[PDB]
Amino acid sequence: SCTTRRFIDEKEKLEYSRGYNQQELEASKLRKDFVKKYIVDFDTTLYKTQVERDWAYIAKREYRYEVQLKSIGYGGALANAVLLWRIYANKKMVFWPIPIVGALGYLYFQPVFFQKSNKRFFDMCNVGEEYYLGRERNKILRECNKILNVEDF
Amino acid sequence: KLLKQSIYDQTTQYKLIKKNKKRGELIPVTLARRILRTKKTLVLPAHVNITLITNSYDIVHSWFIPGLGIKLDCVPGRSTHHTFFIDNVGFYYGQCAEICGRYHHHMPIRVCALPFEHFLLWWNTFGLPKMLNTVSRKRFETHYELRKYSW
Amino acid sequence: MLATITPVLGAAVIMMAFDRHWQTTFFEYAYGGDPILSQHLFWFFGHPEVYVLIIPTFGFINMIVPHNNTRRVASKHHMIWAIYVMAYMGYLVWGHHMYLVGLDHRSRTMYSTITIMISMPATIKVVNWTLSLVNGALKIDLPFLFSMSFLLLFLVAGFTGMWLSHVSLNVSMHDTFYVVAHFHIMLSGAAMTGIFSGIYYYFNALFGVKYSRMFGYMHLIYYSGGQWVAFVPLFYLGFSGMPRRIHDYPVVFMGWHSMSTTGHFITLVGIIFFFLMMFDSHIERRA
Amino acid sequence: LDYPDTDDTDDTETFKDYKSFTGRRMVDTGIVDPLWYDIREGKKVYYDWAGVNQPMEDI
Amino acid sequence: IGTLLYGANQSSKARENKVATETRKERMAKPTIQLTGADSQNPPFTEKNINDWLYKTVSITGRPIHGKGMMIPAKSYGLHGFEYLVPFVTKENEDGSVQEGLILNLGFIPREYAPIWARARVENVEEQTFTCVVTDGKHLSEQGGLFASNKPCENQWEYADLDQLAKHTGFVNQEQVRSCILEHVNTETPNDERDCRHIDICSDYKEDYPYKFTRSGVLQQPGQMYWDLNKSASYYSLLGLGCSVFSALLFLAK
Amino acid sequence: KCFFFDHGLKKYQMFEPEDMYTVVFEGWALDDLITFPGFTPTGRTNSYQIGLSPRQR
Amino acid sequence: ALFFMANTAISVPSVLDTSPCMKQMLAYEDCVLDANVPQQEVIHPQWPTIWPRLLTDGKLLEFDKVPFHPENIYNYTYMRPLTKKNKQYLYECEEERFVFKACLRKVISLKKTDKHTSWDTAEVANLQLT
Amino acid sequence: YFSMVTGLSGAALATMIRLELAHPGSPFFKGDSLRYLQVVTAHGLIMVFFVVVPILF
Amino acid sequence: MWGNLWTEASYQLNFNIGFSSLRSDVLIHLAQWQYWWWFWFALIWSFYYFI
Amino acid sequence: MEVKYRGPSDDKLECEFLENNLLSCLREKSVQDNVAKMTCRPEFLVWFFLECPTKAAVYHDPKGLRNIFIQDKIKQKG
Amino acid sequence: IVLTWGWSSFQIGGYNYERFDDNGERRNTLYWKLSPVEFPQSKLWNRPS
Numbered sequence A: 001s002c003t004t005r006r007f008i009d010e011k012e013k014l015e016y017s018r019g020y021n022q023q024e025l026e027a028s029k030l031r032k033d034f035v036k037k038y039i040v041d042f043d044t045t046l047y048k049t050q051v052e053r054d055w056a057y058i059a060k061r062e063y064r065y066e067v068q069l070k071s072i073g074y075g076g077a078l079a080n081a082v083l084l085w086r087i088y089a090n091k092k093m094v095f096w097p098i099p100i101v102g103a104l105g106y107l108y109f110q111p112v113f114f115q116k117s118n119k120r121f122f123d124m125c126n127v128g129e130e131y132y133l134g135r136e137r138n139k140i141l142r143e144c145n146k147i148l149n150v151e152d153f
Numbered sequence B: 001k002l003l004k005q006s007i008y009d010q011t012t013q014y015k016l017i018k019k020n021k022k023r024g025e026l027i028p029v030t031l032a033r034r035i036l037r038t039k040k041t042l043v044l045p046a047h048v049n050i051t052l053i054t055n056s057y058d059i060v061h062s063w064f065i066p067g068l069g070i071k072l073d074c075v076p077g078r079s080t081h082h083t084f085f086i087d088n089v090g091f092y093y094g095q096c097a098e099i100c101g102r103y104h105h106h107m108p109i110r111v112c113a114l115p116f117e118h119f120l121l122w123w124n125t126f127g128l129p130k131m132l133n134t135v136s137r138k139r140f141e142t143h144y145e146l147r148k149y150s151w
Numbered sequence C: 001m002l003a004t005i006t007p008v009l010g011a012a013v014i015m016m017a018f019d020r021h022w023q024t025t026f027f028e029y030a031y032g033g034d035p036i037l038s039q040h041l042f043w044f045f046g047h048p049e050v051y052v053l054i055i056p057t058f059g060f061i062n063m064i065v066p067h068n069n070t071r072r073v074a075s076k077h078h079m080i081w082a083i084y085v086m087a088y089m090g091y092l093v094w095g096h097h098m099y100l101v102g103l104d105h106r107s108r109t110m111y112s113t114i115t116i117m118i119s120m121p122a123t124i125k126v127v128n129w130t131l132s133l134v135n136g137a138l139k140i141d142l143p144f145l146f147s148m149s150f151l152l153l154f155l156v157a158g159f160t161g162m163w164l165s166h167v168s169l170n171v172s173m174h175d176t177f178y179v180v181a182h183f184h185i186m187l188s189g190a191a192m193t194g195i196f197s198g199i200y201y202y203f204n205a206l207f208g209v210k211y212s213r214m215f216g217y218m219h220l221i222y223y224s225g226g227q228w229v230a231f232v233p234l235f236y237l238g239f240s241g242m243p244r245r246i247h248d249y250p251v252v253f254m255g256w257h258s259m260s261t262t263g264h265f266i267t268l269v270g271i272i273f274f275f276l277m278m279f280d281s282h283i284e285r286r287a
Numbered sequence D: 001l002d003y004p005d006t007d008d009t010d011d012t013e014t015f016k017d018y019k020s021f022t023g024r025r026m027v028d029t030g031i032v033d034p035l036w037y038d039i040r041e042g043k044k045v046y047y048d049w050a051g052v053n054q055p056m057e058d059i
Numbered sequence E: 001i002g003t004l005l006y007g008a009n010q011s012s013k014a015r016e017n018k019v020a021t022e023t024r025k026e027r028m029a030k031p032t033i034q035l036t037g038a039d040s041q042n043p044p045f046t047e048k049n050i051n052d053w054l055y056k057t058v059s060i061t062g063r064p065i066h067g068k069g070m071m072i073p074a075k076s077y078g079l080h081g082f083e084y085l086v087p088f089v090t091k092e093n094e095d096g097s098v099q100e101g102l103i104l105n106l107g108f109i110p111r112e113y114a115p116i117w118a119r120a121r122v123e124n125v126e127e128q129t130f131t132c133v134v135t136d137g138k139h140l141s142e143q144g145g146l147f148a149s150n151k152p153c154e155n156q157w158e159y160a161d162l163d164q165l166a167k168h169t170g171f172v173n174q175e176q177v178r179s180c181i182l183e184h185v186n187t188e189t190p191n192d193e194r195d196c197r198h199i200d201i202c203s204d205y206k207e208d209y210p211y212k213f214t215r216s217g218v219l220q221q222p223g224q225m226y227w228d229l230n231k232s233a234s235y236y237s238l239l240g241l242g243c244s245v246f247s248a249l250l251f252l253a254k
Numbered sequence F: 001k002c003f004f005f006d007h008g009l010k011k012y013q014m015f016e017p018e019d020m021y022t023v024v025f026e027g028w029a030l031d032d033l034i035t036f037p038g039f040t041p042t043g044r045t046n047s048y049q050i051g052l053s054p055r056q057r
Numbered sequence G: 001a002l003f004f005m006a007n008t009a010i011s012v013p014s015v016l017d018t019s020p021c022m023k024q025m026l027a028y029e030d031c032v033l034d035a036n037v038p039q040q041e042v043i044h045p046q047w048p049t050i051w052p053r054l055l056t057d058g059k060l061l062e063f064d065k066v067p068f069h070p071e072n073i074y075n076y077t078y079m080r081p082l083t084k085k086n087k088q089y090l091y092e093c094e095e096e097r098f099v100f101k102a103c104l105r106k107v108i109s110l111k112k113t114d115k116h117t118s119w120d121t122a123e124v125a126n127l128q129l130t
Numbered sequence H: 001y002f003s004m005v006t007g008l009s010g011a012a013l014a015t016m017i018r019l020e021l022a023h024p025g026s027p028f029f030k031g032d033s034l035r036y037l038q039v040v041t042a043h044g045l046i047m048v049f050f051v052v053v054p055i056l057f
Numbered sequence I: 001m002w003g004n005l006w007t008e009a010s011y012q013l014n015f016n017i018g019f020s021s022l023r024s025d026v027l028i029h030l031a032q033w034q035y036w037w038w039f040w041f042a043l044i045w046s047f048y049y050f051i
Numbered sequence J: 001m002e003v004k005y006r007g008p009s010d011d012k013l014e015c016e017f018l019e020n021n022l023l024s025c026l027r028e029k030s031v032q033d034n035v036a037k038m039t040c041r042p043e044f045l046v047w048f049f050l051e052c053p054t055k056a057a058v059y060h061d062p063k064g065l066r067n068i069f070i071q072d073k074i075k076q077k078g
Numbered sequence K: 001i002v003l004t005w006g007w008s009s010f011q012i013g014g015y016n017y018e019r020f021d022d023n024g025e026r027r028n029t030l031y032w033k034l035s036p037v038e039f040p041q042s043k044l045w046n047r048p049s
């Protein structure tokens, strides 16, 4: 699966570079809202079945690594650049930019990574129609398919 | 994976690959089996225990498979019992690992662990007929045996 | 130790000769012979033999380090007791060379347990050697450098031996080049480094003249490098699964065998440097 | 060339095989390397890229 | 001023690339032409009128020679592999010394399997039918950047030089072989330049290498697509605006 | 599918397990080929997970 | 030892089976096993159509020019036609068989089409990532 | 001095072993497996009982 | 190669340093044990560097 | 266990043999094995469907199946 | 020489190998769920074996 992960990441990067149209943006917004509501901002352990709990947690951890940690790294890089700039300007050590600039960078970088990897997180929740999470995932997938005039798994 | 008629010369191809085959600095053992070729590879099923009784005819030898990490000393006069359990479908090579004499270097081993269905097919089609070939050997006999003893 | 063990080897060798010539069938299973008895008797002396080979090597460092450090050696009594415990406990681990022969699991477990327990006195000696180098007046010399190289080789040698003590890994590593690499790093590395260290320590007492530091340094560097380059790739070969005592092997070992040959040639160059060191020292003929 | 015996040397048969249809097809496949010697007027001459010396004279 | 000019040039190149992609997609939208018999042995493609056949789907039968192929370095989905480039022989005599053909780009192959001896198969060197899109290899020839060097004698390539490749192939029809290079393609994939699927494979790489390009992949020009050029132009224009404003403020020195 | 169709005999043939080197670099030189008799007499499926049978007294 | 591995990836769950009619097939197999039918062909849901003689005569293979020498009840289990008890206990498993066959027919009817766009990257939807 | 001579002999035997083991195909002994085994045994015995022992004891 | 099922278990290259195959559970356990054995040396190595 | 991908062979001779086996099986099953000799090989049906999707689609097509049945009846009578 | 290179080299090498070569995975396989896993680098080449 390392080959599959690399291929998916490269596909996401190529799509992000390409850009998105109205329908793609709407579908991505729907997927991101669903993922944030059901995975990121919800305690996965509160679901009913063990299978759905485990797969939802796998999706949540994948989202963490691919979005939250990456955004933290990029925002920290930006905050470190700003910190170096301010240190050179003041000829001393400053501590204000670290928190503020880090938070601003995280807020700037989280939406872009979420848009880039929205499809993967949505697809990883396809546990099955037998469960509540899988049923909601299928409903959102049907809505996205209707919007995009295509069929997806 | 089709047995097609060869328009080339099989003998010429064999001689050419024998003489001037192309090799590389980083060539896998799979493509480089110079000293690891034998005949009638030992076929076993996978995911089940087998009792291996190791012995030697003349002197002490070593049945060695590094892929499985198995080393059994075959000592003359002994019938040493060992447990053999290959937990995966795979083909393993090996070389004897105890000084024995002239052909100590060239004495390879080939053990193929297969899913039970494939192992049973190989059994019924190659080994089971030979167990009665000593007395009865014929296509009708083999068909009768395989139909009579069906798993 | 040699006095204790020599009669066993003599008896085993005499029995082998009798079987070969008079056909006494001592080791013929047909009429009561025990082929494994020969291995038992041989290894009972064989392991104490290697212990006898190694034990004297420690004395060279234990003497040289205090001499150059202007300090007393660390825990001489404890080091003596550690070497003694190794010496008189190596008589119950001769079966680690016979794990796979087919001996009873009880004896196998006893041998493995005592073999792993043997590691502790070696650690004691290592820590004593390390502590002997602290808080003293160091006088760097070629014997001291040889002692450092000996310690560096011995650490890896003993670590690899302890790994071999692992029964499950020993199953795959028996009669492979991993054991070859382990005992080469032990003997050729540590024993020879200690021998050369003692030679440079007693050069004045032996030849009556001082040694030539230039060729001495060249010999040290080249010998240590050759030993390492020769006997490190053998571990890779053992992990790959090359058996022992085989002159023709699969093509997949060419690179590591070439590295081993290069290391051996580097060691030979180091030997050349040692002989040139002796020649130049005698040419200098300085008090 | 063809020394000491054909069964050991097999230069002529190898040359013919390389010059045959099967030899050319194998070379095109690339598993078999190109021929390394040429049979001159009674003598075998290795190519300069073969990385070997010429055979010693028979006297 | 320099960065503003560079950004304007990048925008112009983006527009040109978009127009080129549109026309190439329209050309590829046409059906495929099957060349057989005499047509296959003597392909109509020629440097005189190559532009007529550029980016056109042709099914051609010939005898590839994997033994003497070329491995032009390339990056495909993070893999620093090669684009297999084989001399595709179209007609040969009985002896085989004199032969003619073209250059066929089989597709992307990983670096590990690039060597012939590193593969677990014996390449077939009999007549085979390949559907390919005719291309001039513009991006392949223009890649490599500065200091790029190639050694045809050592069969090591850093960029696709048509004349050197033709010389290496040794075909009699040197002009015909150098005119264009064929790329193995699949005609059952979307004809969208922005598909993001350049090679006909799945996420598991089930298909056996080399992986043939798709129509979208053939249309795609790595590092020179219109969206990338527009992004670069926007960055350069912003840098310009900033530097120009700073210089104007310095000049005013109010 | 452990068997291969033959254009000469118009039948499926199989050989004993062989290493990758033998299969790839010596496909043109094969021997012991035998007609494929089928996994089961009636054509059923033998694809089951086998275990350990009860021991003998 | 206690924590020699220093970490355990308990998150990695058992891979979830994603086969179309696995549940139906397993239920039918369980019912057939409860039927205690010596024949094995009944495992396939379409046995009455693949082996019509299994209900009347039981001769599934043509034993022409081949000896037939049974030694016990386990020799030619496939040559014994189903009896009244076997027929009853297999009729007691018709709902499961019908559902399994319906699922198989639905899977067969399902076909690949150019409409699908996530076909290449279907592993994420199949939940192959962990 | 005798130990130096014996160590040179052992080094020569080790060189023979390494040259034989350099690459497959027996470049040194050219198929003499028995000769190689004899050389290995001689090397081991000489190094053990006639280099280290004479040097130390 | 038992059909399309590639049964080969060892693919070690010319300069292989690890085990020939890692399909065997015994070899997997040995590799993991060796890795963590090497892991558990931080304080000792730092102390030796300092001395 | 690693299994390498390979699409349906679609070999002409192999698919002809498999189609002949399928026709024999259909003829026998239509009459419920009320024939002197049972030549049907149920195993080869799966291989037919796996290796020759084009012929499977033709057989599934009502028109193709009708034409195949007509031709088979003509050949059997003749 | 002593600490940082020896404690970071192997991990760096394995990470780069996974990045650029898919940990040496052999492609052309089916159903990764059933396919075996090609483990990342685990044998410390910097540590004497």
Ligand code: HEA
Binding pocket: C050, C051, C053, C054, C096, C097, C115, C116, C118, C119, C122, C123, C126, C154, C155, C156, C157, C158, C159, C161, C162, C164, C165, C166, C170, C173, C174, C175, C179, C183, C186, C187
């Ligand atoms: C000088 C020679 C010598 C010495 C000193 C030793 C010392 C030891 N030996 Fe060995 N051995 C041989 C020479 C020697 N050996 C020979 C020649 C053979 C093969 C004979 C033949 O068949 O031909 C052999 C075979 C052999 C085997 C059989 C392998 C097999 O056949 O598969 C075993 C099994 O446990 C073993 C174990 C040990 C142990 C536990 C020690 C202990 O004494 C070692 C204790 C020391 C330590 C354990 C060091 C602790 C390490 C540190 C303090 C450093 C730590 C640092 C890091 C980890 C970075 N030896």
Ligand code: HEA
Binding pocket: C180, C184, C187, C188, C192, C195, C196, C199, C230, C244, C245, C246, C247, C264, C267, C268, C271, H001, H003, H004, H005, H006, H007, H008, H010, H011, H014, H015, H017, H018, H021, H040, H041, H043, H044, H045, H047, H048, H051, H052, H055
């Ligand atoms: C003291 C013991 C000792 C020493 C020093 C060595 C040193 C070396 N050994 Fe050996 N070896 C063994 C004991 C030793 N060996 C044993 C017991 C076996 C098992 C045999 C068997 O099982 O059959 C073996 C097996 C063995 C094999 C396996 C062959 C096979 O199985 O096919 C190989 C392969 O390369 C080998 C190589 C080497 C090399 C390159 C050196 C190099 O280190 C050699 C370089 C030279 C020296 C290290 C000494 C030089 C001496 C001097 C310069 C004189 C010094 C004098 C004074 C200081 C006064 N040895």
Ligand SMILES: CCCCCCCCCCCCCCCCCC(=O)OC[C@H](COP(=O)([O-])OCC[N+](C)(C)C)OC(=O)CCCCCCCCCCCCCCCCC
Binding pocket: G001, G002, G003, G004, I039, I040, I041, I042, I043, I044
């Ligand atoms: C009476 C006998 C004892 C009771 C029975 C238990 C015996 C069997 C188990 C003993 C060994 C357990 C080893 C676990 C693996 C870790 C090895 C290790 O870190 O070694 C390197 C370490 C030193 O190496 P290090 O410096 O790399 O340490 C790791 C450093 N960090 C975390 C920064 C990476 O050696 C030790 O000192 C380890 C001692 C064992 C672990 C103790 C941790 C504290 C927990 C309470 C212990 C209480 C004592 C009893 C044991 C606990 C259970 C009852």
Ligand SMILES: CCCCCCCCCCCCCCCCCC(=O)OC[C@H](COP(=O)([O-])OCC[N+](C)(C)C)OC(=O)CCCCCCCCCCCCCCCCC
Binding pocket: K001, K002, K005, K006, K008, K009, K010, K012, K013, K014, K016, K017
């Ligand atoms: C008292 C003395 C005690 C001695 C203790 C024994 C020490 C033994 C170890 C010695 C190591 C010596 C340094 C080796 C450096 C190797 C770097 C390398 O190739 O990368 C490895 C690793 C391997 O990375 P990799 O990605 O290539 O992985 C290997 C290959 N694959 C991917 C297939 C697994 O790379 C790195 O660590 C990358 C960062 C390196 C940064 C530092 C570079 C230093 C370059 C050399 C020094 C500078 C030149 C001038 C030196 C002048 C000296 C006077």
Ligand SMILES: COC1=C(OC)C(=O)C(C/C=C(\C)CC/C=C(\C)CC/C=C(\C)CC/C=C(/C)CC/C=C(/C)CC/C=C(\C)CC/C=C(\C)CCC=C(C)C)=C(C)C1=O
Binding pocket: C152, C153, C156, C221, C222, C225, C226, C228, C229, C266, C269, I045, K001, K002, K003, K005, K006, K007, K046, K047, K048
């Ligand atoms: C965490 O960090 C650590 C590790 O992890 C990286 C460790 O692994 C380890 C474990 C390491 C060890 C136990 C030590 C391992 C070994 C080490 C470091 C040394 C290895 C050294 C090498 C491989 C270098 C090779 C050796 C050589 C001698 C090369 C010599 C090179 C050259 C060019 C010389 C060539 C010359 C000749 C052949 C001779 C020619 C000249 C003459 C004949 C004479 C000429 C004379 C005249 C007059 C002209 C440690 C301790 C650690 O701290």
Ligand code: CUA
Binding pocket: B061, B062, B096, B097, B098, B099, B100, B101, B103, B104, B105, B107
């Ligand atoms: Cu048999 Cu070594």
Ligand SMILES: [Ca+2]
Binding pocket: C247, C248, C249, H020, H021, H022, H023, H024, H025, H026, H027
């Ligand atoms: Ca050799």
Ligand SMILES: [Cu+2]
Binding pocket: C046, C047, C048, C093, C094, C096, C097
């Ligand atoms: Cu011992």
Ligand SMILES: [Mg+2]
Binding pocket: B062, B097, B098, C174, C175
């Ligand atoms: Mg042994």
